[PDB]
From a paper:
During virus entry, A27 mediates the attachment of mature vaccinia virus to cell surface heparan sulfate. A27 also tethers a viral fusion suppressor protein, A26, to mature virions.
Hence, we further purified the tag-free A27 protein (aa 21–84, C71/72A, named as tA27) for X-ray crystallographic study. Finally, the initial phases of tA27 protein were solved using multiple-wavelength anomalous diffraction analysis of tantalum bromide cluster derivative crystals. Monomers composed of tA27 protein fold into single α-helix structures and assemble further into a hexameric structure using a trimer (which corresponds to the crystallographic asymmetric unit) as a building block. The trimeric building block of tA27 contains unusual triple-stranded coiled-coil interactions with two parallel α-helices (chains A and B) and one antiparallel α-helical strand (chain C) using the N-terminal region interface (NTR Figure 1B). The antiparallel α-helix (chain C) uses its C-terminal region interface (CTR) to form a bridge-like structure that connects two trimers into a hexameric assembly. This unique type of parallel-to-antiparallel interaction within each trimer is distinct from the classical parallel trimeric coiled-coil structure common to other viral fusion proteins, such as influenza virus HA2, although the individual coiled-coil of tA27 and the heptad repeat of viral fusion proteins are structurally similar. In addition, the Asn75 side chain OD1 of chain C forms two hydrogen bonds with the Asn75 NH2 of chains A′ and B′.
Numbering used by the authors:
A (entry chain A), B (entry chain B): 25 to 64
C (entry chain C): 22 to 64
Write the structure that this text describes.
């Protein structure tokens, strides 16, 4: 496993984690929008 | 050097995701507290 | 993959990113050091 095989692997892992994380971000953002409408 | 750029990009993404993770976690607790106050 | 928590996965990923970065730094520094010895022998 070259340094470069490790880098490539980590780039993939960060991409998978980010996609998953982005779904949480969208739901968090929707939650703020819902609260905003309930508050006002 | 493309290795340096790759490493820098990977560091930035993991830092961005971990700081956003903390922010969203705080915001969800804060939203719960407001939602509690809206009822009571 | 594993029944790790998101937090564990991210912590693990931070550590691997840190290890590979450190590894790259050590290799670069090692190369410099070899070059310093070669420089001293060549002037």
């Amino acid at each position: 496993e070259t340094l470069k095989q490790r880098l490539t692997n980590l780039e993939k892992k960060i991409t998978n984690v980010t996609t998953k994380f982005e779904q949480i971000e969208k739901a968090a953002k929707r939650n703020d929008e819902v609260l905003f409408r309930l508050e006002n």
